[PDB]
């Protein structure tokens, strides 16, 4: 039971996915071809959560790779851990999207999505008790954004009682990365608000800040960014794969993190984040870890959480630790700075812990924040949208594929309503 089906969509989604599968492989003692070389029975206890088993003690990611844009997935295939994936789980088309949500969601994507659905259905049958679907995509592209949304819609329709979580790479609002990005992001957000249970919002600006300010690093590559994302992802599902004291789960996190159904946009983080060079200068106390977790500079969304109240926060620890220390730390944090946590929810925090630290660390932790401050992100996107749409700039590319003006307007309206709702709890 507790089995998860993974989907990766578009270029970004595929790239992050590759890293994710490397990291999970490492964690579960799977070598690049798919053989197990672990020394602990803990490693295989719940290996089924991510991997199917095949003849000859072969383990295969329960993973589907989708891209209308071909060649990105060819790179994945050519890569080191590319050989672990099932060839029949590569679903790809013969035309790009030109960063066009409409082509991903309405036309080109609609032609490919049937295949993906078929594969998903097949995957679902090998679940004893399907926990849900985990998606990796990007907002600002065409495939991950449009087709990702399309696929999500379909899957929710077919499996409405299973959990739908998305790790979505959003724009960097201070320095935007395509021209039609705002249009795409706005169109996707509309779909995600309605058709997912949780969305982890990751932005490259924040990642770079983390790399530079916190980790004291330079020359960071997309690979490194993917690594960081993958670590958070793995952290999220640790309690489904392994033992512990308080064990989390997807819906458990959703239960503690989503106090109103539409407010399900999270800012993920990891701790510790210090330099590789200056290792010995610091040590691993639970208080230090929590400090790292909670500090704005260590978050991977493009907000100052200090410009808003936390509705709820989930901390997931790995390593054998004093629960007293944990709880007391949380309490102290709440007491000292009660203004940053909304006063209408007693005990805004949540703890979970797993007796199994990942590779090097003795103590690691994953942060999941739901703050009213995230309104800023949406607000800026809506500002961007309006400036263009009021002049109908770039709109012909979308109307040409059968999209209507009214839809755009409605999407904007929904985005604004989201912002308003967030402001309510601020």
């Amino acid at each position: 039971m507790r089995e998860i089906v993974h989907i990766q969509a578009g270029q970004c989604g595929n790239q992050i996915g590759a890293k994710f599968w490397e990291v999970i492989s490492d964690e579960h003692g799977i070598d690049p071809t798919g053989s197990y070389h672990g020394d602990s029975d803990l490693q295989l206890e719940r290996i089924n959560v991510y991997y199917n088993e095949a003849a000859g003690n072969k383990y295969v990611p329960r993973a589907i790779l989708v891209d209308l844009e071909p060649g990105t997935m060819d790179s994945v295939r050519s890569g080191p851990f590319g050989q672990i994936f099932r060839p029949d789980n590569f679903v790809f088309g013969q035309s790009g999207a030109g960063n066009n949500w409409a082509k991903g969601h309405y036309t080109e994507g609609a032609e490919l999505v049937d295949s993906v659905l078929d594969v998903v259905r097949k995957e679902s049958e090998s679940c004893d008790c399907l926990q849900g679907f985990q998606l990796t995509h990007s907002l600002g592209g065409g495939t991950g954004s449009g087709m990702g949304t399309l696929l999500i819609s379909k899957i929710r329709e077919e499996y409405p009682d299973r959990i739908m979580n998305t790790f979505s790479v959003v724009p960097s609002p201070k320095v935007s990365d395509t021209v039609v990005e705002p249009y795409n992001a706005t169109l996707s957000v509309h779909q995600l608000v309605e058709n997912t249970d949780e969305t982890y919002c990751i932005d490259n600006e924040a990642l770079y800040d983390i790399c530079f300010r916190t980790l004291k690093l330079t020359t960071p590559t997309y690979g490194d960014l993917n690594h960081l994302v993958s670590a958070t992802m793995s952290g999220v599902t640790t309690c489904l794969r392994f033992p512990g004291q308080l064990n989390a789960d997807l819906r458990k996190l959703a239960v503690n993190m989503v106090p109103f159904p539409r407010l399900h946009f999270f800012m993920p983080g990891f701790a510790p984040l210090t330099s590789r060079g200056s290792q010995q200068y610091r040590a691993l106390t639970v208080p230090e870890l929590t400090q790292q977790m909670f500090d704005a500079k260590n978050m991977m969304a493009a907000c100052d959480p200090r410009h808003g109240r936390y509705l709820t926060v989930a901390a997931v620890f790995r390593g054998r630790m004093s629960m007293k220390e944990v709880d007391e730390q949380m309490l102290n944090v709440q007491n000292k700075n009660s203004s940053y946590f909304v006063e209408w929810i007693p005990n805004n925090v949540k703890t979970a812990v797993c007796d199994i630290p990942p590779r090097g660390l003795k103590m690691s932790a994953t942060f999941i924040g739901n703050s009213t401050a995230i309104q800023e992100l949406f607000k800026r996107i809506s500002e961007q949208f309006t400036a263009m749409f009021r002049r109908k700039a770039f709109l012909h590319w979308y109307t040409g594929e059968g999209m209507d003006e009214m839809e755009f307007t409605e999407a904007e309206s929904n985005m604004n309503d989201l912002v308003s709702e967030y402001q309510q709890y601020q």
Partner: protein, 427 residues
């Protein structure tokens, strides 16, 4: 796969194409005879192993293509890809179109169809002509029109030789260019335009060369083309397919003209007196004189900009550079576009030919720009045309082959409309 065809038409176009093919041969390891991974985007996979390109080579002038047919890059080409006729238009729009071209065009179309029949996902075309030259303006327009009927969903990108304001070559360009604009407009998607005066200026300052040729120019153009295309062929951090240059560059469906500019374009001498960092390259890209047309871009708001970084490139640095650019007060941008920049970062660097002056660089960029600042040139062209046409200079030649004069008027009206649109955009 992302697998496509090119079109090289008229003397100039053919020349450019030669250079392009040479560059491609260098890049993908192919020897001039066809002997040696992802090359196959252009070079449709072959019988006995020896690779053959997918390019439409057309010239109603025999001479240039005849030269090609006895060159080094010779057996590489298919006999049919290269096309021949009899005589030039002689800068006569009413011969590429209407009279003489409506004869060969069918053959060209057939060839194109055949080429398409090898694609498993034809992402579109690349077209090389001249806003000015008689063959490659009328004829090319005609071809584009034909393609529009036979391939509605497929992108048709154009590489264009706009005539510089002051300098000239043949003194009927103002007619021809305008005519081309009138009949290209609605059938092409994108028209990447490069002047020659600008290039010469660049050569004098940046490359430290004061005795240029056409060959050098062609090589430079080819470099730009390579930069544009490399995401189709090789791997990358971020891959820009041909169809992105529609959607990240055409804010409205008549504004089809971007300026194509390259950096670093510096020789070996004071390359070693330089760092050649990402930020510096970016800065160079947005400077006025390094642009490959004659606009003062400070006189005109940017609509959409698109950058194609190649080689040893860390995205963080790129982001920083872009932020810096955004910060600058002189690099103006429109009221209606916040996300002004589109970025492509490709793990393969550019590759340098023997004879090509531009030295080996670990990192390089090609920039594509839409602005109200292109409108100045258009206005100048219009003015030239109007001055010519009022005294009915050389009108009887075009009219004497097969044309209405009202066509000219229509073209002028179209230009005016375009200008108005640009003004509106600026507002």
């Amino acid at each position: 796969m992302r697998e496509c065809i090119s079109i090289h038409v008229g003397q100039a176009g053919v020349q450019i194409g030669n250079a392009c093919w040479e560059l491609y041969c260098l890049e993908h390891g192919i020897q001039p005879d066809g002997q040696m991974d992802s090359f196959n985007t252009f070079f449709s996979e072959t019988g006995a192993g020896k690779h053959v390109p997918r390019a439409v080579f057309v010239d109603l002038e025999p001479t240039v293509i005849d030269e090609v047919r006895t060159g080094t890059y010779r057996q590489l080409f298919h006999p049919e890809q290269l096309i021949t006729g009899k005589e030039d238009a002689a800068n006569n729009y009413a011969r590429g179109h209407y009279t003489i071209g409506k004869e060969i065009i069918d053959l060209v179309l057939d060839r194109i169809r055949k080429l398409a029949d090898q694609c498993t996902g034809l992402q579109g075309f690349l077209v090389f002509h001249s806003f000015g030259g008689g063959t490659g303006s009328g004829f090319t327009s005609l071809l584009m029109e034909r393609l529009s009927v036979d391939y509605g969903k497929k992108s048709k990108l154009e590489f264009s030789i706009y005539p510089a304001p002051q300098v000239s070559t043949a003194v009927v360009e103002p007619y021809n260019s305008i005519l081309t604009t009138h009949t290209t407009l609605e059938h092409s998607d994108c028209a990447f335009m490069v002047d020659n005066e600008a290039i010469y200026d660049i050569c004098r300052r940046n490359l430290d060369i004061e005795r240029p040729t056409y060959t050098n120019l062609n090589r430079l153009i080819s470099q730009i083309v390579s930069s544009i295309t490399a995401s189709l062929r090789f791997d990358g951090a971020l891959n820009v397919d041909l169809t992105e240059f529609q959607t990240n560059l055409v804010p409205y469906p008549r504004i089809h003209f971007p300026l194509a500019t390259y950096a670093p374009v510096i020789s070996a001498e004071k390359a070693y007196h330089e760092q050649l960092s990402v930020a510096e390259i970016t800065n160079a890209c947005f400077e006025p004189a390094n642009q490959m047309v004659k606009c003062d871009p400070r006189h005109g708001k940017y609509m959409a900009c698109c950058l194609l970084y190649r080689g040893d490139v860390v995205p963080k640095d790129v982001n920083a550079a872009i932020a810096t650019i955004k910060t600058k007060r002189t690099i103006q941008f429109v009221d209606w576009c916040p996300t002004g920049f589109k970025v492509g970062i490709n793990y393969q660097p550019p590759t340098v030919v023997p004879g090509g002056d531009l030295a080996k660089v670990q990192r390089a960029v090609c920039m594509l720009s839409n602005t109200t600042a292109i409108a100045e040139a258009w206005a100048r062209l219009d003015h030239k045309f109007d001055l010519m046409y009022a005294k009915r200079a050389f009108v009887h030649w075009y009219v004497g082959e097969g044309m209405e004069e009202g066509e000219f008027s229509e073209a002028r009206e179209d230009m005016a409309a375009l200008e108005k649109d640009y003004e509106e955009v600026g507002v």
